[PDB]
From a paper:
ECF transporters consist of two identical or highly similar cytoplasmic ATPases, EcfA and EcfA′, and two transmembrane subunits, EcfT and the S-component. The membrane-embedded S-component serves as both the substrate-binding and the substrate-translocation domain. The other three subunits (EcfA, EcfA′ and EcfT) together form the ECF module that energizes substrate transport by the S-component. Here we report crystal structures of the group II ECF transporter for folate from Lactobacillus delbrueckii (L. delbrueckii) in the apo-state and in complex with the slowly hydrolysable ATP analogue AMP–PNP.
Author numbering:
A (entry chain C): 8 to 175
B (entry chain B): 2 to 282
C (entry chain D): 6 to 264
D (entry chain A): 1 to 280
The structure:
Amino acid sequence: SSKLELRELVLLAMVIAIKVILGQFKVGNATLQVGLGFIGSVMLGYLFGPWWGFAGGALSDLVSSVIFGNLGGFFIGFTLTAALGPMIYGFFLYKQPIQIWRVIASVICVTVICNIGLNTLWVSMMYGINFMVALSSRILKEMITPWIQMVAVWFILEGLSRVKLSRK
Amino acid sequence: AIKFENVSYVYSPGSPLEAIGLDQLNFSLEEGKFIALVGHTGSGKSTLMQHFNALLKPTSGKIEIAGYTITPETGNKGLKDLRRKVSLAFQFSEAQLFENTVLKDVEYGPRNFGFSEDEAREAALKWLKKVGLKDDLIEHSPFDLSGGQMRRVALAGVLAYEPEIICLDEPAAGLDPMGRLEMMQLFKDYQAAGHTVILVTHNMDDVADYADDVLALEHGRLIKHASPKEVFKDSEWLQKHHLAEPRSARFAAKLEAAGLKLPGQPLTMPELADAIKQSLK
Amino acid sequence: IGRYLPGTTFVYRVDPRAKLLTTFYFIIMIFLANNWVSYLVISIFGLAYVFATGLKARVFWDGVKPMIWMIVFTSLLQTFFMAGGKVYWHWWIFTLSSEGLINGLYVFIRFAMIILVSTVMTVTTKPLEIADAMEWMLTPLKLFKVNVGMISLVISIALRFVPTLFDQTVKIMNAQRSRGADFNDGGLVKRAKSVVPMLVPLFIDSLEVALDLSTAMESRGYKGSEGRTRYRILEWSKVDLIPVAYCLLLTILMITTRK
Amino acid sequence: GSDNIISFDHVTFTYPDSPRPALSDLSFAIERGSWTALIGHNGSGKSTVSKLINGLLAPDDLDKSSITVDGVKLGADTVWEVREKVGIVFQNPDNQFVGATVSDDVAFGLENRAVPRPEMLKIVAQAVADVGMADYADSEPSNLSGGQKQRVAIAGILAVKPQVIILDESTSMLDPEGKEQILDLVRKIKEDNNLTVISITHDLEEAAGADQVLVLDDGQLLDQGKPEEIFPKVEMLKRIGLDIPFVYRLKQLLKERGIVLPDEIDDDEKLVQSLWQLNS
Ligand SMILES: Nc1ncnc2c1ncn2[C@@H]1O[C@H](COP(=O)(O)OP(=O)(O)NP(=O)(O)O)[C@@H](O)[C@H]1O
Ligand SMILES: Nc1ncnc2c1ncn2[C@@H]1O[C@H](COP(=O)(O)OP(=O)(O)NP(=O)(O)O)[C@@H](O)[C@H]1O
């Protein structure tokens, strides 16, 4: 057509605006911060599907980049990684039921595949091995957070956001 | 027992561009009387709203309300119990609500203040009837409702735990006249029931016809605090500090200017009907 | 609640798609090379640009501050690349060398010069200009498989509704707090489950504006992206040559010294 | 002659769902160059009317259905051409706003029609100038009062030069001063270009100044025509779900204590001069 249209598309614009705002704030306790940008990433997955999802994350990094820093930039490639997160949330969750097998396998991979490999690949811009050790230095979060994330994602998604999807 | 002791407020403090919401507010309010709040837009009246439930704290002075006292220092420690007394339903309360049903959403308020399940169940229906809608839809989900019902259940969820002081900003801002004189009736019926009511609306028709206290505001400054008479009577004054006469006061003043001077103090229409028999008398 | 832009009153900060493209060009110029003198020419040029603006230095610290730990962690750990290197003694393998610690000054200047031009961009210009700047970077790829009408449109809408979603967020925060919502507090679960009352009413308010905006859009005659005109229209004026000077003058000599 | 009519027809949303959402048979019409209010309780179907006329929504008969606006039958095709004779100012500007500056928003429809920019500039200047928004013309939506946001809404549609301006509760939550001005704006606008303003409002005091009003309740119209004859419907009109205006309640609250009632008589200066006469 191409797929979607206005009112499908104006919605896509309002749910990226969420994840540039979300990814700004962190909650968090004295014990651990676990910043919440991730809800934005998972929403783009199960609603708009995998392939619009990839288009969501890529744009959400460009959007934040104007009103915020990008902590650097541009890269380009930071945006590439911001993209791939929502996409593989699209798989396991789109045209797919609500199930415990779909959510957790998705959370664990986001950290390891895209978050690790790509973050392990971008400040790279040099040789790889100096890079792995800076991130190897940073791993604990990727051990703890994904697990609180699966609990959190179940409480949002099955947690009346998806049940309130309809209607309307 | 509302008291504001030299209380100002400044936005973005310790930062450049500090806009001032409130400048040296000094005043005290009657316990259990209808207190209207009015001004031009961007007066800072909505700031003042979240001041005495202590969502914001003063950057100067003292606020004594509900037997508490709110300093610039006062922390976030015991504000829980401050809010069972004072309550806000913000301009759009329809957007305030959630979960799977109407009943569990209103009891959410009392539940957060430690009501028993039984207590919260009965307290739920107790105020879901009081807001006059409805037997069957009490168990319905909150999201399929009309704008009349959506801004009811919200206003129930705020009233369900029975706040002693209740302050609502523009609660009728979107309703129809059947709604207004419905919703404005409950505010006045809760009032003589022994509870304070702050109400902030541009509408000057129900400010004169209902409210006892009115306190105007301009550029963060408190310009007048009085009965809706003292402030309303001076015509060109209301121009200078931008406000407006109610519907009665407008037409009477005009018929008076070329015409007869009745003994009012016009306020509400019943008194107007009194004022225009005396015309021939 | 804006960020960052102490862009007030001084000269330049002009022609964003020129400026943006430059910072994109400077990034990849650093990325390229090399052992010596190449790192000298790009570092001096990068420094030339930042006080050409006349910007208060204090703002540059704001961007490197979170990364400072990350800099000196990789820098010295690069040195201690187990052998590794390189030229001198003092001492082991496994330890410092005159060659080992120069490489660790290079990761410092690259990380700096990234976060200099990245800063110099994100500050001196304004968001709606930058949006029209990276609309230009998208311009060439149109006739590849991507409709640029849509990925230009959603950005435009997103940006405009980012603050007005933020304010309706805090309105929901305070509206719930006033009703006895307490957060974060709690621990783990419920800390957490207390986040949903700020989420779903934020979600459903998004639909209300989604419908309303799409409704109000179509009614004003929005058929599609194809076949419009444009109001905004950025222009190159005479200063344009200065970023092309930087671009072509630095990087012909930087490429010769590259190898 | 007459600008717009809705013949026998019915409508539903979202699509045909359960119980029976609809307006009704309706059987409704309005004259060229006349301000006409449309009133009913919340959920009486006042929004649909505006979107029906607009073309965004379609009726559920399509054989019986005829909605013709200045000589076009609506109905699938031709919808963008009927969409150019009408324009709509929705309540709550924030969501209805699109574009960076205000001079950006009000030329939107203009670039929808592929108007060259050299012309676009001139029109848009005059547009914001017309609505008094002149030197706020580089400002972004967030800075503007919801009142003056709804001035930018006006200049938006005023730009494409429509023959019918619908106001959908546009004035709803504004200042008293701000609600005063916006109508006096569109009322100024009306005489200038000779247009038709379909107002929709819950405010009954500004419905009194309509040329023709019409009431809509639960599905359908009950009474319609000149405000003079519609407002006297008294008791029933109260139970109907809406209410009395002030002058008419003044009539009512006078008579309640016995005082005389010469009627209709719907104005201000016409009252005030009549007041001299009754004093005698
Ligand atoms: N977050 C903020 N930061 C800085 N200044 C603010 C902020 N919010 C509001 N203000 C200022 O404080 C005032 C807000 O007044 P306020 O009473 O909230 O608006 P209002 O329209 O008059 N009342 P209401 O319609 O009920 O919201 C204005 O002068 C604003 O410029
Ligand atoms: N998907 C839908 N789209 C539009 N209207 C709907 C939809 N579903 C139900 N409706 C009904 O459409 C009716 C339109 O009435 P409406 O005109 O909104 O009255 P209102 O309360 O005064 N709001 P408005 O006049 O639009 O400012 C409402 O009663 C809704 O129940």
